[PDB]
Point group: C2
Chain length 118, copies 2
């Protein structure tokens, strides 16, 4: 049981170059039928958007996540340009859930970054 | 190695290792799906991250989140299928060489597969 919108701590190592690395929170963004399939076999993959506490300059393909509603300890930003499909074994520990507003803007960021305007 | 001129829809050979579980692994073709503003930025800076869809020649069953890619037009040596469920942002340091490009109809199917997989509507 993992669901779209949930924030999990995930293990991204090893990484190369500007790829998000270390262990960090990430938002599940794959659909829940795929999530259910991945949990079924046990293996399978799920797609997540990594999160960083280094807010700095926020781009239109990135979304500010509130520590107050997510369970995070500080406000972070989800980087849609770092989207990654991961083996379920990289899931470490659940932290929380994004609001509906935050998730909707993350759908917008994904559509922008991947040029999915239709 | 290569000059970083990758653009959306192109097929490039990329190094995905090391990988865990069902993650697409080793060096294999993948389809560039990140927007060309970001890709051109990566060209200008000579570094960045490029979002790709890895490819497998194990056709088997083509699910709605996967797209059949023909050997005739891609420059691939056999028919392959793009796996939207394996979408991954990768360092430009992982790009090995350009292979070719998918057709516009194939890229449109890949757009639909991505929207399906990531639960997006437009």
């Amino acid at each position: 049981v993992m669901r779209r919108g949930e924030i999990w701590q995930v293990d991204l190592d090893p990484a190369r170059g500007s790829e998000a690395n270390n262990q960090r929170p990430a938002v599940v963004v794959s659909n829940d039928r795929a999530n259910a399939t991945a949990t079924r076999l046990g293996r399978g993959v799920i797609t997540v958007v990594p999160v960083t506490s280094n807010i700095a300059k926020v781009y239109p393909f990135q979304v500010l996540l509130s520590a107050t509603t997510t369970g995070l300890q500080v406000d972070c930003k989800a980087q849609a340009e770092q989207i990654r499909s991961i083996a379920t074994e990289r899931l470490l520990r659940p932290i929380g859930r994004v609001s509906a507003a935050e998730l909707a803007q993350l759908d917008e960021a994904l559509k922008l970054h991947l040029d999915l305007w239709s």
